[PDB]
Amino acid sequence: DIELTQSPSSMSVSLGDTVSITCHASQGISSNIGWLQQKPGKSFKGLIYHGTNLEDGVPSRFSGSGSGADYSLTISSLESEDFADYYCVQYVQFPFTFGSGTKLEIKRADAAPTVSIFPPSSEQLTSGGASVVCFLNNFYPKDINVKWKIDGSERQNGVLNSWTDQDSKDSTYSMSSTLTLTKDEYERHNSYTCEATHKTSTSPIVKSFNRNEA
Amino acid sequence: QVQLQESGPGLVKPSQSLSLTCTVTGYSITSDYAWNWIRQFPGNKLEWMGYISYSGSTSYSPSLKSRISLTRDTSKNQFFLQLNSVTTEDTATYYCVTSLTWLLRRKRSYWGQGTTVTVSSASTKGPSVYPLAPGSKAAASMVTLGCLVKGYFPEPVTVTWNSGSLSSGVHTFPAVLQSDLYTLSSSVTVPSSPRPSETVTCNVAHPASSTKVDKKIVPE
Numbered sequence: 001d002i003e004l005t006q007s008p009s010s011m012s013v014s015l016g017d018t019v020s021i022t023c024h025a026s027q028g029i030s031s032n033i034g035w036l037q038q039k040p041g042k043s044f045k046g047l048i049y050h051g052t053n054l055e056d057g058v059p060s061r062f063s064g065s066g067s068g069a070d071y072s073l074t075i076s077s078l079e080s081e082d083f084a085d086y087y088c089v090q091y092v093q094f095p096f097t098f099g100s101g102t103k104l105e106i107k108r109a110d111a112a113p114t115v116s117i118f119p120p121s122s123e124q125l126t127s128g129g130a131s132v133v134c135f136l137n138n139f140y141p142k143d144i145n146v147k148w149k150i151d152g153s154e155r156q157n158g159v160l161n162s163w164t165d166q167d168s169k170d171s172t173y174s175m176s177s178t179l180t181l182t183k184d185e186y187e188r189h190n191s192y193t194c195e196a197t198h199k200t201s202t203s204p205i206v207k208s209f210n211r212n213e214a
Numbered sequence: 215q216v217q218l219q220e221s222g223p224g225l226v227k228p229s230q231s232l233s234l235t236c237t238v239t240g241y242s243i244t245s246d247y248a249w250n251w252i253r254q255f256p257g258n259k260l261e262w263m264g265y266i267s268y269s270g271s272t273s274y275s276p277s278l279k280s281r282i283s284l285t286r287d288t289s290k291n292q293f294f295l296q297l298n299s300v301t302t303e304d305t306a307t308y309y310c311v312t313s314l315t316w317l318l319r320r321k322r323s324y325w326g327q328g329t330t331v332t333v334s335s336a337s338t339k340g341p342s343v344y345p346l347a348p349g350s351k352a353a354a355s356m357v358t359l360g361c362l363v364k365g366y367f368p369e370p371v372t373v374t375w376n377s378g379s380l381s382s383g384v385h386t387f388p389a390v391l392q393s394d395l396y397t398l399s400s401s402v403t404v405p406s407s408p409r410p411s412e413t414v415t416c417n418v419a420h421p422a423s424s425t426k427v428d429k430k431i432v433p434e
C-alpha cells in the first residue's frame with residue numbers, strides 16, 4: 001500500500017491566517033493526488049485533483065502544489081467555512097489510500113473548565129448500579145487530564161470519557177467522565193473525587209462528594 | 215445536476231452481509247467514470263473499498279476481495295455494495311462516490327451523504343434515564359444539572375431540555391460503547407434563581423423502541 005502521511009494532524013489558527021498542510025507518499029505518485037474537505041458532522045467535498053487543479057466551485061483561496069512524493073495544500077486567508085477536516089488521497093495505485101487527516105481548529109484565549117460532580121441517583125441505586133458523573137465544561141485548550149480517586153486512591157477501570165467537538169459559540173471543549181460501579185462497591189467507599197489537570201491552574205481542579213452527604 | 219444518495223438498513227448482525235444501494239440521478243452510470251465505495255471508520259480513518267466502471271468492470275481492495283461484491287442495475291441507474299461475513303470492525307459510515315467527472319468547466323467529483331452501519335447482536339434495548347441533580351455543595355450563581363442515558367441500543371437518542379425552549383448552556387456528549395450498549399449524558403447550565411422554581415425537564419427519546427421518557431431534575 002502507498003503510505004500517505006499528513007502533517008500536522010491538527011492546528012489552532014485564526015480567521016485571516018494562511019495555512020499549509022502537507023502529505024508525503026511512500027513513493028513517487030506522479031501528481032495523482034486529491035485533497036478532500038470534510039465538514040462537521042457531515043459529508044465530503046473534493047478540493048483539488050491531479051495535485052494542482054481546483055474543482056468546479058472551489059473558491060480561489062485553495063491551492064495545491066507538489067511533485068514526486070511531496071504535495072501540499074494551501075489556504076490563503078482562512079474563513080469560517082474553512083474550519084474543517086482535510087484529507088489527501090493517492091489514486092495512482094490500488095488500493096487508493098488516504099492520509100490520517102488534519103483538523104483546523106479555531107484558536108481562542110485560554111479558559112479554565114467548570115467542574116461538576118454528580119452522585120448516583122436514588123433511582124439508579126434501587127436497580128443496583130451507581131454511576132458517578134463529572135462534567136468539565138467550556139475549557140481551552142483541548143488538553144485535559146482527568147483522574148478519578150476513590151477514598152484517596154486513583155481508579156482506572158469503569159471510567160468512560162467523552163468529548164464534544166469545538167463549540168461554535170465560545171470555541172471551547174467540554175468533557176464528560178463517568179465512573180460506573182455497582183451498588184455493592186459504591187456502598188463500600190465514602191470519598192469520590194473527580195480531579196482535573198489543566199494549564200489554566202497550577203493546582204488540579206478538585207471536585208468531590210461523600211456518599212454520606214445528601 | 216449529478217446527485218448520489220445511499221440507501222439500505224443501518225443495522226447488521228455479525229457473520230451476515232451488509233448491503234447498500236447508491237441511486238444516481240443526473241448522469242448515467244454507463245456513460246463514463248468509476249463509481250466508488252469508501253467507508254470512514256469511527257476515528258475518521260478512511261478506507262477505499264472498490265469501484266465499478268462504466269463498462270461493468272470492478273476493482274476491489276485486495277484485503278476485501280473475498281468478501282466484497284460491487285454490482286449495478288443500469289436501467290434504474292444505481293449500483294450496490296455487498297460485504298459478506300461482516301464483523302464488528304465493519305461498523306462504519308459508508309459513502310458511494312464518483313471518480314473525476316467533466317460536465318462543467320473543471321472536473322468535479324460527486325459524493326453521497328453516507329449511511330452509518332453498525333454491526334452488533336444486541337436487541338433494541340431502551341434507555342435508562344437518570345436525573346443528575348447537584349449533590350449538596352456550592353452553589354454559586356450558575357447551576358449545572360445532568361441527564362444520564364445508559365444501557366441503550368441502538369443509536370441514536372434525542373435529548374432536549376424543556377421541550378426545546380432550553381437551548382443555551384446545553385451540552386449533549388457523544389455516545390460511547392459499554393459492554394455492547396450505549397451510554398450518553400447531557401448537561402444544562404441555568405442561573406441559580408431559575409431552578410428549581412422554573413422546572414428543568416430532560417426529554418429523552420429512543421426511536422428504535424418508540425420510547426419517550428421525561429425525567430425532571432429535582433433537588434436532592
Ligand SMILES: Cc1cc2c(cc1C(=O)CCC(=O)O)[C@@H](C(C)C)[C@H](C)C2(C)C
Nearest residue numbers: 034046089091096248250311313314323
Ligand atoms: C477512481 C478514482 C477514485 C477516487 C478518486 C480518484 C479516482 C481516479 O482514478 C482519478 C479520476 C480520474 O482517473 O480521472 C478520489 C477523488 C476525490 C478524486 C476519491 C478518493 C476516490 C477514491 C473516490
